[PDB]
Each structure stands twice: as C-alpha cells, then as structure tokens.
Structure 1
Amino acid sequence: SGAIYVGNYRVVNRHLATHNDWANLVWEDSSRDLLVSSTTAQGCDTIARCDCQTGVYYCSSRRKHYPVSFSKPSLIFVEASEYYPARYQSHLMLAVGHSEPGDCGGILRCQHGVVGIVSTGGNGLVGFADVRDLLWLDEE
C-alpha cells in the first residue's frame, strides 16, 4: 500500500483505490495502473520534473529503501495478477529489486522529488508507474 500526497491530490495504484477515492475522483487510467483523488488537507510530497534513471524506492516487504537504476517509461507486457489480466502497461519503468504484491504504492524518488510508485515486479523485478509527465499535479 501507499500513496503520493501532493497539493490537494492523493495518487494511488488504481487497483488499490478505495470507495472514498472513487467518490472524490480527479483522474484514472487503467493502462497506467494510476488513480488520483482529491484531498481536504494539503500534502508534502513534491513531484520530480526530470529524466533521472537512478533513484531510491521503498520496499514494505523488507522495511527498507533501496537505491536502483531504472528504465525510461515504456509500454511493457505485464503477467496476469489478481487485479489485471496479462496486458501491456504504459508509462512503466523497470528495475532489479525485490517486490511482492503488497508493495504496490511504495514511492520511487530521485534528487528532484517523487518519480512514481511501485506497480509491477516479481522474480527480482520491480516496476514503477511514472508520474513525472502529469504536470497538472503541481497546480489547481
């Protein structure tokens, strides 16, 4: 589990969104595994606006933050899980790192801010949904 809290937005994995998230929906995209809802309180996270390919992510199944090298956001085939059939997921970045289903939502960050959240993984992979192109998270 986990979310990004920027401005009056809450960014979560679409497959983990709550009823309250759907009842206060701003934007969702199944192909990216992302959903954004509105919040009453202002958050403290800031979004990275960069092309970094190195950063650090939080892994809840290890209680640890790991430094990783990751690929550029791309269209990658992801195996079937409890939440999606086997399909192509867009804006996904891959790295070598530990991962388990409960880990969706951990933040990946670089020197500029939050880059994305855990969304895919398995066999020593972990995949991150990018949020750096969502410029509207910084305003309104």
Structure 2
Amino acid sequence: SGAIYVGNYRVVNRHLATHNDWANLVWEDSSRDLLVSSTTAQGCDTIARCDCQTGVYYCSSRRKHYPVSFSKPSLIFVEASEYYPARYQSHLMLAVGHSEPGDCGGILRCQHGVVGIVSTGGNGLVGFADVRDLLWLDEE
C-alpha cells in the first residue's frame, strides 16, 4: 500500500483505490495502473521533473529503502494477476530490487522529488508507474 500526497491530490495504484478515492475522482488510467483523487488537506510530496534513471524506493516487505537503477518509462507486458488480465502496461520502469504484491504504492524518488510508485514485480524485479509526465499534479 502507499500513496503520493502532492497539493490537494492523492496518487494511488488504481487496483488499490478505495471507495472514497472513486467518489472523489480526478483522473484514472487502467493502462498505467494509476488513479488520482482529491484531498481536503495539502500534501508535502513534490514531483520530480527530470530525466533521472537512478533513485531510491521504499520496500514495505523489508521495511527498507533501496537504491536502484531503472529503465526509462515504456510499454511492458505484465502477466495476468488477480487485478488485471495479461496486458501491456504503459509508462512502466523496471529495476532489479526485492518486491512482493503488497509493496505496491511504495515511493520511488530522486534528488528532484517523487518519480513514481511501485506497481509490479517478481523474481528480483520491481516495476514503477512513472508520474513525472503528469504536469497538472503541480497546479490547482
């Protein structure tokens, strides 16, 4: 689990969105595994606007932050799961790092700010949904 809190937005994995998220919906995209809802309180996270390919992510199944090198956002095949059928997920970045299903939502960050959240993984891989192209997260 986990979310990004920027401005008056909450960014979560679409597959983990709550009823309150759906009832306060701003934007969602199944092909990216992302959903954004509106918040009453202002958040403290800032979004990175950069070209970094190295950063640090939070792994809840280890209670630890790990440095990683990650691929550029791209269209990657993700196996059928209990949340989606076998499909291509867009704007996904892969790295070598520990992950388990419940690690979705952990933040990936660089020196510029938040880059994305854990969205996929398996066998010593972890995948992150990029948010750096979502420029509107920085405005009302």
In structure 2, the gaps of 5 or more residues are none
Cα distance, 1:86 vs. partner?
Answer: 0.9
Q: Distance in 2 between matches of 1:64 and 1:81?
A: 25
Give the drift of 1:80.
1.0
SS of corresponding position for 2:75:
strand
Please report how far the alpha carbon of residue 82 of structure 1 lies from its aligned counterpart in structure 2 after TM superposition: 1.0
Q: Does 1:32 align with 2:32?
A: yes
Give the aligned length. 140
Give me the TM-score of the superposition, normalised by structure 2.
1.00
Structure 1 Cα separation of the partners of residues 59 and 122 of structure 2: 13
Percent identity (aligned): 100
Q: Alpha-carbon deviation of 1:83?
A: 0.3
Q: TM-score if structure 1 supplies the norm length? A: 1.00
What is residue 72 of structure 2 aligned with on the other side? 72
List runs of 5+ in structure 1 lacking aligned partners. none
Name the SS of the counterpart of 1:80 in structure 2.
coil
- Please list the CA deviations of residues 64-122 of structure 1 after superposition, one character each: whole Å capped at 9, or x if unmatched: 00000000000000011110011100000000000100000000000000000000110
Any idea what the Cα deviations from partners look like across 1:7-30, whole Å, max 9, x if unmatched?
000000000000000000000000
Runs of 4+ in 1 over 3 A off after TM superposition: none
- Match of 2:20, SS state, is helix
Give the distance between the partners of 2:71 and 2:79, measured in 1 at CA. Answer: 18
- 1:99 is paired with a residue whose SS is coil
- Aligned counterparts, 1:1-140, within 5 A: 1-140=1-140
Partners in 2 of 1:14 and 1:86 — Cα distance?
A: 16
Higher mean displacement: 27-36 or 80-89: 80-89
Distance in 2 (alpha carbons) for counterparts of 1:17 and 1:82: 15
Instruction: Look up the SS of the partner of 1:77 in the other structure.
Output: strand
Q: Deviations over 1:32-86 (max 9, x none)?
A: 0000000000000000000100000000000000000000000000011110011
